[PDB]
């Protein structure tokens with residue numbers, strides 16, 4: 001054992017883990033670069049080359065006038081596929097979740113939308129309603145270049161999605177075509193929204209100060225209410241329009257290069273979209289645990305962890321799940337939680353190994369919280385400037401398992417957004433069934 005040696009090991013672990021550190025000045029630089037990229041995406045002259053697409057959603061700040069009744073909501077792209085029935089009068093919901101097979105997410109668009117329509121059919125039978133033709137709102141968690149609220153093309157798949165015959169086509173069209181092939185129900189697709197947009201809308205229903213939507217789950221993205229005069233891609237300078245930043249693609253033109261560590265390159269190289277969504281790759285739940293797995297293999301190689309031996313499970317892709325990062329950080333100090341996770345990964349961890357794993361997890365999750373904060377602060381700072389407000393009071397509607405379930409992420413992120421947002425008063429709100437509710441609320445407003 002030896003207490004002096006155990007300590008020397010933790011000191012070398014720390015020297016390696018120090019590479020994850022971001023100073024406040026590094027965060028201001030990342031923020032200013034994000035802001036620079038946001039200005040570029042919004043302008044007609046630089047939009048095509050901008051990595052941050054600042055996509056117009058066609059969701060506008062409207063005086064009001066919502067329709068009443070039953071609205072169907074679809075949710076694709078997060079954790080599984082969701083069908084929701086929404087009653088607007090007051091808003092009450094009925095919902096069901098479906099596990100998307102891999103063969104659908106990695107086969108053809110036809111297979112993907114066929115499965116989606118099969119699920120819709122099943123939801124309608126379980127609620128006895130495959131006869132009623134309802135207005136339908138679609139949450140589609142991918143970059144889309146809109147023509148209108150109900151018409152938009154998929155730019156590219158993100159988060160490991162690979163279905164053929166989708167990129168370059170109208171997503172509402174693919175959906176509508178799938179429903180017709182099946183022929184057992186009828187729906188009127190009135191709106192297609194990003195998950196950030198749906199979250200902002202459902203959170204706004206509870207707090208009218210909500211004008212920013214943020215996702216920190218499988219992926220990482222944000223939307224906000226932009227001045228119509230700044231939205232150059234849409235003719236008009238009156239009122240506001242929701243803009244999907246698609247900030248996951250920040251760093252794709254080399255904007256984050258000085259901060260990319262070896263673990264980031266490996267995660268990217270072994271990903272379904274290499275060279276894409278690099279900022280998201282620093283924060284997202286699809287990558288977080290994989291980043292911890294890579295750091296652990298590095299420490300196994302320096303003879304600082306597990307007697308320098310990694311098990312088959314520790315050398316398995318995606319084996320250190322993001323939930324294990326959250327769970328390792330939940331550990332009360334007894335090390336029981338860390339121990340069980342490691343035992344299940346075929347390791348014989350000592351108390352020191354448990355502590356080192358705890359440290360690698362905090363280094364990765366604290367970096368994610370800090371990178372994410374630079375992005376939110378840039379959006380918020382830009383809004384304060386655009387609205388020419390001395391002190392801007394805004395509410396941010398947030399969804400996702402990383403922001404929601406990680407034990408310290410949320411706290412580290414809020415404190416870092418605060419340091420970077422002086423003269424800003426930010427309220428953070430967590431969405432209760434965010435996406436589904438949001439897509440139907442936009443549908444009720446749109447259905448006039």
Ligand SMILES: Cc1cnc(NC(=O)c2cc(Oc3cnc(C(=O)N(C)C)nc3)c3cc(C)oc3c2)cn1
Pocket residue numbers: 058059060061062066067088149200201202204205210211225440441442443444445446447
């Ligand atoms: C074509 C088009 C253009 N813009 C929109 N625009 C919209 O649908 C719409 C709905 C909104 O949120 C709402 C949430 N709930 C309710 C509500 O209480 N209902 C009963 C629905 N209303 C609004 C918000 C909030 C912001 C900051 O901008 C919004 C736009 C919709 N369609």
Ligand SMILES: OC[C@H]1O[C@H](O)[C@H](O)[C@@H](O)[C@@H]1O
Pocket residue numbers: 077078140141142143158159194195196215216217218219220221222246248277280
């Ligand atoms: O799900 C969170 C985010 O993940 C990815 O970055 C998608 O491209 C984006 O559309 C979505 O909002």
Ligand code: NA
Pocket residue numbers: 228229230231232233234235236237
């Ligand atoms: Na405009």
